[PDB]
Amino acid sequence: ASLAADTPTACCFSYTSRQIPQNFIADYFETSSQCSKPGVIFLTKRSRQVCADPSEEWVQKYVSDLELS
Amino acid sequence: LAADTPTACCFSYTSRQIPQNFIADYFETSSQCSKPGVIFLTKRSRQVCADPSEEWVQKYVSDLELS
Amino acid sequence: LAADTPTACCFSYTSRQIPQNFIADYFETSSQCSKPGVIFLTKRSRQVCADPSEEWVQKYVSDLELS
Amino acid sequence: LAADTPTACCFSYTSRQIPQNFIADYFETSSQCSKPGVIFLTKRSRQVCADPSEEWVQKYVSDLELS
Amino acid sequence: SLAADTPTACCFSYTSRQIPQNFIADYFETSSQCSKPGVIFLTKRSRQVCADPSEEWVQKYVSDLELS
Ligand SMILES: O=C(O)[C@@H]1O[C@@H](O)[C@H](OS(=O)(=O)O)[C@@H](O)[C@@H]1O[C@H]1O[C@H](COS(=O)(=O)O)[C@@H](O)[C@H](O)[C@H]1NS(=O)(=O)O
Ligand SMILES: OC[C@H]1O[C@@H](O)[C@H](O)[C@@H](O)[C@@H]1O
Ligand SMILES: OC[C@H]1O[C@@H](O)[C@H](O)[C@@H](O)[C@@H]1O
Ligand SMILES: OC[C@H]1O[C@@H](O)[C@H](O)[C@@H](O)[C@@H]1O
Ligand SMILES: OC[C@H]1O[C@@H](O)[C@H](O)[C@@H](O)[C@@H]1O
Ligand SMILES: OC[C@H]1O[C@@H](O)[C@H](O)[C@@H](O)[C@@H]1O
Ligand SMILES: OC[C@H]1O[C@@H](O)[C@H](O)[C@@H](O)[C@@H]1O
Ligand SMILES: OC[C@H]1O[C@@H](O)[C@H](O)[C@@H](O)[C@@H]1O
Ligand SMILES: OC[C@H]1O[C@@H](O)[C@H](O)[C@@H](O)[C@@H]1O
Ligand SMILES: OC[C@H]1O[C@@H](O)[C@H](O)[C@@H](O)[C@@H]1O
Ligand SMILES: OC[C@H]1O[C@H](O)[C@H](O)[C@@H](O)[C@@H]1O
Ligand SMILES: [Cl-]
Ligand SMILES: [Cl-]
């Protein structure tokens, strides 16, 4: 399973301005609803975490492909 | 150097007293976070959200800085 | 792990292409920065701001991601 | 004492005041940054962005500079 | 870990003759904002010497420092 104890929560306060190349994407996560602002956190193959605006539609297809695979 | 990176925000503090002997480092959460918080790091690299308004925490923060 | 920490921004870009053999890592600058930028880290631990519009810059980033 | 190195900018200041004896050093941010900023260095080498307008920030800088 | 409001290092004159490589301790390339592109070699005597980045030996010294 997955343990979720007293542990910091990953929240986004600033999204990327430029669309990440999909072939750089390795995985995705979504910020907890407790966060003040929404956000999607893409994990690049270089293991970098990038905040992305979920309202923007390029991040939404990226999630679709990741899930539907 | 990292950019557009998520910000660590505590939403649940630990109620107990942490053995200071286990503490290795500390980080106070961002002001952008909805609530204040301090993240202690243990020697097993385990991040723990702690309440800054509580007082065993600032003592740990003080001793970590004043050193 | 940090909070209320400064952000790396590029206000000028290198005029010469860095030999790829020197490249250790890369970091794209924050969207909050006034200008676009890529920060290449060399093996001598030099931090160089590069123009993301240059094709050699885009290639280096691609190679680092696909490795 | 510079190069085409990235620049330290502040986009988020700390809300509450830092205890003074935590501060080890300071330096203002470049004017090229979209926002003004004062970066306090703690005794644990941790960098904190501070609002130059705030009363305590100006006082901390004053004390550091008169030593 | 980044720069502030200070004076950027610029080279307005390079060096005609080649520094003995075993004198070189480190190197820094000047900003592109400068008029002339330059390389600053730091000697073991902690001295700073400007150098033409397009010269044969300068590129070699930088290469040897990086690949170490
Ligand atoms: O030599 C080549 O053909 C390689 O691809 C070229 O496109 C690169 O030119 S660059 O874009 O114009 O400046 C060359 O630098 C490159 O030589 C490389 O060798 C390896 C492998 O390349 S990578 O794409 O396959 O993985 C690597 O160390 C560098 O990518 C590059 N190093 S080099 O020796 O400095 O040129
Ligand atoms: O305050 C530091 C800031 O750094 C930026 O690079 C991030 O995108 C923000 O999420 C963060 O708040
Ligand atoms: O993290 C576990 C620790 O909890 C503390 O409350 C106890 O006093 C310690 O004995 C124990 O090691
Ligand atoms: O297409 C989007 C582009 O964004 C830039 O910021 C990156 O440096 C490129 O690698 C990428 O191709
Ligand atoms: O802000 C004033 C500072 O003065 C320095 O000389 C001291 O070393 C610090 O302990 C103090 O915080
Ligand atoms: O600092 C001494 C330097 O001497 C040079 O000749 C070497 O190439 C470097 O690896 C070394 O760092
Ligand atoms: O001497 C060689 C150098 O001369 C300078 O005036 C130019 O700006 C550079 O492009 C050139 O590399
Ligand atoms: O001005 C003459 C010099 O120009 C430099 O840019 C070249 O690297 C040298 O080879 C040449 O001797
Ligand atoms: O010592 C290294 C040598 O490398 C050669 O490629 C250069 O032409 C010489 O100027 C230099 O002295
Ligand atoms: O040493 C200088 C040489 O380094 C090599 O890695 C590349 O071919 C160029 O950057 C240059 O010709
Ligand atoms: O590519 C990175 C982007 O983010 C930066 O904020 C720039 O304002 C924008 O022009 C650039 O395209
Ligand atoms: Cl929040
Ligand atoms: Cl800016």
UniProtKB/Swiss-Prot annotation, chain E:
The record marks R17, R45, R47 as: Involved in GAG binding. It comes from the Eukaryota. Disulfide bonds join C10-C34, C11-C50. Changing R45A: Strongly reduces heparin binding. This is C-C motif chemokine 3. The lineage of its organism: Eukaryota, Metazoa, Chordata, Craniata, Vertebrata. The chain holds residues 24 to 91 of 92 of the full protein.
